[PDB]
Design an enzyme around this catalytic site. Structure first.
Site, PDB file in Angstrom:
ATOM      1  N   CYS B  27       0.810  -1.222   0.000  1.00 49.71           N
ATOM      2  CA  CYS B  27       0.000   0.000   0.000  1.00 49.71           C
ATOM      3  C   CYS B  27       0.849   1.282   0.000  1.00 49.71           C
ATOM      4  CB  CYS B  27      -0.977   0.023   1.172  1.00 49.71           C
ATOM      5  SG  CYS B  27      -0.186   0.050   2.806  1.00 49.71           S
ATOM      6  N   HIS B  88      -2.373   1.185   6.817  1.00 52.92           N
ATOM      7  CA  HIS B  88      -2.893   1.056   5.460  1.00 52.92           C
ATOM      8  C   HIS B  88      -3.324   2.387   4.911  1.00 52.92           C
ATOM      9  CE1 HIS B  88      -4.371  -1.469   2.124  1.00 52.92           C
ATOM     10  NE2 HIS B  88      -5.404  -0.600   2.035  1.00 52.92           N
TER      11      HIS B  88
END
Lengths: 148, 146
Positions: B27, B88
């Site tokens: 990510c 994230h």
């Protein structure tokens, strides 16, 4: 205690249900993705578990997003082991199939993983999604996930 | 207007911002690559580091719904949430909110393919029901699309 993967498939006659069963346990999810009729994951609870040895069922009412076919059943039918994730984090979570209560949960964030007759394997410094592409690989007991 | 950005997500996808780790499994990488293409300055680091950076530098939006509004206006919007282990981040794009509340996004993930969105999942389908309501949306002050 050995876990075999339980393949999750569409049920005919129940429009957005996906599940699978064996001799002991039936597991089911509902797909609420508007765009996908073949989804890889279910983020909206409940998960339905049916104990075929008692005739009873129960619901798991909350839970990380569940991976279709990261669901596993134990040889005796007593535990249901599920892979769950959120963002970049993930976990393996064993539920009691009679009560739907969480029995054990292990954070496996950042690792590749695989479950088989032999047990659980986790790996790092991977080149791919499969644990075999991992440089370092650790074998972990599944005993806490399922007990007598 | 979000074109410029969509393009940036698709190109950034197959790339490997960091070493031998392809963006689709990282990510932080994927976001850095989108920010690269658009020439937008993004904090260095892993996911958590990125969130701290955005917390301090970037203008913070009030809702996923507004996030999609800013995104529709060709701005760059990052949905971020920190974790104990691995946080994230994801690039918010325009279009319909899932459950009228969670905007569509692009993100890669070490969680596996299930945590990967090619504009086809909302942030509400990559984070779970708990994390889903704790997301922060951050936006860069300059409309990367012209």
């Amino acid at each position: 205690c050995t876990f075999t993967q339980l393949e999750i498939v569409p049920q005919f006659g129940s429009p957005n249900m996906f599940g699978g069963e064996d001799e002991h346990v039936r597991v089911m999810f509902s797909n609420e993705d508007p765009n996908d009729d073949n989804p890889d994951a279910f983020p909206e609870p409940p998960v339905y578990l049916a104990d075929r040895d008692s005739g009873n069922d129960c619901r798991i009412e909350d839970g990380g997003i569940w991976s279709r076919g990261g669901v596993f059943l134990s040889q005796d039918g007593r535990r249901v082991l599920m892979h769950e994730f959120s963002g970049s984090s993930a976990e393996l979570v064993s539920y009691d199939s009679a009560t739907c209560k969480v029995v054990h949960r292990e954070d496996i964030s950042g690792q590749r993983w695989a479950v088989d007759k032999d047990g659980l394997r986790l790996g790092q410094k991977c080149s791919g999604e499969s644990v075999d592409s991992c440089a370092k690989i650790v074998k972990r007991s599944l005993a806490p996930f399922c007990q007598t | 207007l979000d074109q410029c950005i969509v393009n940036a997500c698709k190109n950034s996808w197959d790339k490997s911002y960091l070493a031998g780790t392809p963006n689709k499994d990282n990510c932080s990488g994927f976001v850095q690559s989108v920010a690269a293409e658009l020439g937008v300055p993004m904090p260095r680091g892993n996911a958590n580091a990125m969130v701290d950076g955005l917390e301090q530098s970037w203008t913070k939006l009030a809702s996923g719904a507004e996030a999609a509004q800013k995104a529709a206006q060709g701005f760059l919007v990052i949905a971020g949430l920190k974790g104990r282990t691995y946080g994230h981040v994801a690039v918010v794009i325009s279009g319909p909110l899932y459950r009228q509340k969670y905007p569509m996004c692009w993100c890669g993930s070490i969680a596996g393919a299930v945590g990967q969105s090619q504009g086809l999942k909302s942030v509400g389908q990559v984070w779970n029901r708990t994390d889903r309501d704790r997301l922060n949306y951050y936006v860069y002050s300059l409309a990367s699309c012209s």
